[PDB]
Design a protein around this nucleic acid. Sequence first.
RNA 1: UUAAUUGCGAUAACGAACGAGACCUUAACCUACUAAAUAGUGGUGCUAGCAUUUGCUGGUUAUCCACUUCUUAGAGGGACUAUCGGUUUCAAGCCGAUGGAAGUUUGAGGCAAUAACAGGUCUGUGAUGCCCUUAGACGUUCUGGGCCGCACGCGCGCUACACUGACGGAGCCAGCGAGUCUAACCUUGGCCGAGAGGUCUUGGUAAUCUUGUGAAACUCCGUCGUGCUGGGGAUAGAGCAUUGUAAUUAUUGCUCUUCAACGAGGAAUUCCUAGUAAGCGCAAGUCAUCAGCUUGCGUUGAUUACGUCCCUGCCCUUUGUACACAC
Lengths: 103, 145, 82, 167, 100, 63, 53, 141, 143
Amino acid sequence: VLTDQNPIQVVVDAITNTGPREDTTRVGGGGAARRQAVDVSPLRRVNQAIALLTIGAREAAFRNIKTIAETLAEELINAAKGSSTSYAIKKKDELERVAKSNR
Amino acid sequence: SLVVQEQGSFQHILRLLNTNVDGNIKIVYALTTIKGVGRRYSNLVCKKADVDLHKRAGELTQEELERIVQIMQNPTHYKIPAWFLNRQNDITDGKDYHTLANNVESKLRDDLERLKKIRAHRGIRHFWGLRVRGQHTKTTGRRRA
Amino acid sequence: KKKWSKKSMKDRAQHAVILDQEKYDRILKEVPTYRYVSVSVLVDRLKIGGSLARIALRHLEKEGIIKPISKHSKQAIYTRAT
Amino acid sequence: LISKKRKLVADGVFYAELNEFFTRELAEEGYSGVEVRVTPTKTEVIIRATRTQDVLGENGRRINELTLLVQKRFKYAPGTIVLYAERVQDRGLSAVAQAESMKFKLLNGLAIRRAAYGVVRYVMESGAKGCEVVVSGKLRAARAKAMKFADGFLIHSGQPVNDFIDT
Amino acid sequence: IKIRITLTSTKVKQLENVSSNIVKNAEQHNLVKKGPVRLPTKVLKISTRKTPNGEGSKTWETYEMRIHKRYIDLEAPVQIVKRITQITIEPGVDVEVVVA
Amino acid sequence: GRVRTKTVKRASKALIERYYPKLTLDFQTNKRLCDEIATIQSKRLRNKIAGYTTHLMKRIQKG
Amino acid sequence: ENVWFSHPRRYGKGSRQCRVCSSHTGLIRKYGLNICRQCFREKANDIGFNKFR
Amino acid sequence: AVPSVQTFGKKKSATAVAHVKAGKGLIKVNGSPITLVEPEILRFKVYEPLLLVGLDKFSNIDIRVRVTGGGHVSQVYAIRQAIAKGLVAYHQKYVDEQSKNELKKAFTSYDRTLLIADSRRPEPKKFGGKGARSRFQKSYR
Amino acid sequence: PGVSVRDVAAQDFINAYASFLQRQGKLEVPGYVDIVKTSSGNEMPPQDAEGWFYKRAASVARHIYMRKQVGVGKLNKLYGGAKSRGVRPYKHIDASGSINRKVLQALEKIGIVEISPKGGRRISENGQRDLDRIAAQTLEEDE
RNA sequence: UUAAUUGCGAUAACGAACGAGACCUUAACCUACUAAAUAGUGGUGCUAGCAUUUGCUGGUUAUCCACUUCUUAGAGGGACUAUCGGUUUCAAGCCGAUGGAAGUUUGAGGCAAUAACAGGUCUGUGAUGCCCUUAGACGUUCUGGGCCGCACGCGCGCUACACUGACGGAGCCAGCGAGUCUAACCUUGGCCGAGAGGUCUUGGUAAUCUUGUGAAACUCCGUCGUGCUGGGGAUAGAGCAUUGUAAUUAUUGCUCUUCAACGAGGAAUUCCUAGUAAGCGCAAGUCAUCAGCUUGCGUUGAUUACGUCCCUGCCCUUUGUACACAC
Ligand SMILES: [Mg+2]
Ligand SMILES: [Mg+2]
Ligand SMILES: [Mg+2]
Ligand SMILES: [Mg+2]
Ligand SMILES: [Mg+2]
Ligand SMILES: [Mg+2]
Ligand SMILES: [Mg+2]
Ligand SMILES: [Mg+2]
Ligand SMILES: [Mg+2]
Ligand SMILES: [Mg+2]
Ligand SMILES: [Mg+2]
Ligand SMILES: [Mg+2]
Ligand SMILES: [Mg+2]
Ligand SMILES: [Mg+2]
Ligand SMILES: [Mg+2]
Ligand SMILES: [Mg+2]
Ligand SMILES: [Mg+2]
Ligand SMILES: [Mg+2]
Ligand SMILES: [Mg+2]
Ligand SMILES: [Mg+2]
Ligand SMILES: [Mg+2]
Ligand SMILES: [Zn+2]
């Protein structure tokens, strides 16, 4: 009803858009260990996208009158567009910025 | 699908049984604010008074409120079956009452006074401020006050 | 007794419980322009309560302003009819 | 008029009480187990021992004593319970018997190693594939310590233990 | 003449031997019968702490007893009846014969 | 892991050492003659022995 | 006297005891065998109880 | 006599027997048409074989299913398994084998568990835990 | 083509039959109605309160049309539920027996069910006819 | 190389044993065998209702007839990493795909070596040495209290902090199991009672009766509406019942009323890799009564690795040791 596109196209666009491409990880030889930046696999991209979307929808619908379904709809639409209002896109950009800083 | 606009005689917080009862919430759970009146009792008296339970308490008439008050103040007169009552076979007269807003505290207190002056175990317990229903005191009721 | 928490209060909205003519004709003129209409919409927009929102949704679908597409309980989904 | 579950656990408890009674009473006669065959017209109890002559006594006197004890204790009718005695095959292939022999030797005063090695020699002579004897407790001191005497090979794991090993 | 023979053993091999000899006897005498109906083998479980005392890892032990129950229905004269109850006995196997 | 033990391997080696003008590259008939020509207590071990004999005969067909 | 064994023993842990060890604690009352758990672990293979799993 | 088969579909602990004969195309479940299986969505989950192979192949045959055991979801999965297997049995015994091959190919190309039962079974419960693998909680101090 | 109770959804049938009974207004209501919870495990009484005895009776009628024989015990088991025991974990508690007993007595007096051998209550012929006709109309309401 | 001193093999070692594995139990396959009103199915008789045009849904113990797909078992079969392709001194073996019910030693368990702990237990034992005590006894037994006692500190848990929700109606599905004799168990059905429960009967010594254990979570319709609120339900008052000789420091159950903290939990820390975690309840154990516990059972059923030795530990080899109650 909102965003008359195919909603399956909408969700796959959301997944493609909120998939963190670069991420950090502890690498070291012992006491000399740092958080180094690395690529991200596509399967982990998909999984992290789904997790971020669902967690944002959940903690949005929590303790408020809106429903889990319409919160998830908000999340998916804003993620397919690219918003910086969605929990998912915000976390994505945070992680990518951190990995850029820790190259 | 019922939309009647309303006429502005609606009232917010009202007063009865010396309790500032809230409007803007349905009458059953509004009346629950009255100490001595719970969900069952209030639902039952609001059924016996034949007031619509879909109505908000602030949207009601003084005659309805007085009917409800009269019922809860002498409920057995209106075919209430004598086991909904908080004080039945009381302790002195053997009749069945139903205490309300301030009478609940006064009656609890005179019960404790009876037990204390009798030096009963439960009265001594209440006086000392401990648990009386036989619970274990070793791990609970630590910062009880 | 240390709680290990923050305990930040909120604003405590006061959504309406019963309506009048101003809220009614605001509803009647504003439930169009809404591409998606449900209780959440009729509370984040017009500050009526959820009960009033349920009743108003049934009412408007009676007249025919909002079109239903699925009336599953706990989630009523309406669009605007043109 | 009893359920089959309780009937069978009662059968088992009966067998166990009989086994304990006989291994307390006939220890000096090589009691190497008992069988219980119930039947129409009676229940028969087949003791398997070595000194059948001493189990019988004179004129079956002790057998009569034991029949009467069993009957009086287990509420049987006179004649519905019978006791038979049988010379056990393969005396060396019976752990309870060799353990009782060890017990009587150590009580008469024989030495631990002499007794245990006599037992293991008799067993491995009696057509066995392996035997093990463990004596544990106070041996020539206050501090206790075990002594494992063995010959041949033994197994410890699997269903072959329940099948072949006698403990 | 409506006899039921129920066998309520713990030993599957002895029970099946008894059933086989009974049915072949009835078959060489040519007696109509309902074959050996095998009821669900019922498992008697007992769960116990392995230890006498209380200390140690809480290790549990489940002992089982499997009770196997068979029944056969025969139409038979009194002579074959009395001889069948005469015979078909083995240790550890309990039998119950009932008429009607 | 599917590593065979020395019981299986020795049994297969003996079966090949004295029944070669015989059992072939087929597990089924090799099994159906293993139970014919050897005393094995368990079907599982019989089938393991048959499988290893088939593997060794495949090896023998090439060198 | 008539107060030597006065107190009833119709129920509770005093009405039962192991038929072997004469103990009130740890009874197996299932299937009417009434044996302490320890003596049951001792006599199970005799009674016909075995471990399979 | 009439051409008749009887099959079973299975799940964790539910079994759905299915009598399949020649008829006029009625598909009942325990007393009732196929449109009242009562999750309202696994209804579409159970329509699947019909919707795949075309309802023309159900016009000449009567199907009647009796389900017991399990819960609602497992009963639905058993129903659809039994329906598919009974259809294949009918087409194997009375219709020729080419139709059986095409039907089986369609069913397995959509979903493998339509004809073959899920071998997943409950793992037993072990002491020291509330479940098979879980343990209770370790306390050190 | 013929129809039966088993060809229509249970919710639709029960709603239609309860409306039929409430409009007919002859079955019964004992008098302790509008007081009771229907279960020792429930926390509040029913919310409609302008009926619900007809709903219970329609549900019982469908149940006995389906089954062969039932009793107040079976119906208490069926209509019971999880009693929230406050701070202790939940537990199945069976429903109130007087309710279903008087429902069955009223269904007898109106002639929808009868007492049966092997104990219990069974569906009668005129009650079967009534439920079948109500089901037919419940289905063809959708015209 | 393997889960594995499991194997390939190398070789001052050869040949063996124990453990591992093999084994046993269980769960999964068998429209192939044996059969079975103590499990079912179909048809035919009798019968109810709707349609009527054949039909659809049901009931029916002495209506029989036929059968065994589902259920029960007993004997057996089946998988052995089978076939194929890659990889490896080209050996053991490993990876992938196909087929198959099943291809992580098929899954889960049982059994489970040598050597030891000065682990626990004499409060399981009529198993026990020594010591003590042994008639105003530490024996035994009767009455009554206590083991619950609470300014506090820890551990296992149950309830929850709410709309992926509470409530009310409808819908409505399991499995592991227990049960009365010289007794009084599991209890259907009928009646009374708001409820708990009471009463008159009934069946079952049990695949037959309780019990399709009509479980709960679940789904569908409605009420509520972000408010410590109809969330949550401790803490208290009064009354009605049951168990038991006896409930008083409430045994438990039920009714009404009271309606506390709790707004997702700090430093820390536990369990877990698939029908598993988690949620959900049911049976049994203890038991006259008392589950918030345990042992098992099933119902709904995710996410995320399929890797590493960074922390905590284990195994083998080499190495150093001023250690041997052994960092
Ligand atoms: Mg919400
Ligand atoms: Mg679990
Ligand atoms: Mg319900
Ligand atoms: Mg819960
Ligand atoms: Mg018929
Ligand atoms: Mg190859
Ligand atoms: Mg294993
Ligand atoms: Mg001891
Ligand atoms: Mg204590
Ligand atoms: Mg613990
Ligand atoms: Mg509540
Ligand atoms: Mg609900
Ligand atoms: Mg069942
Ligand atoms: Mg740890
Ligand atoms: Mg219990
Ligand atoms: Mg107690
Ligand atoms: Mg305990
Ligand atoms: Mg791993
Ligand atoms: Mg150095
Ligand atoms: Mg030194
Ligand atoms: Mg140091
Ligand atoms: Zn004992």
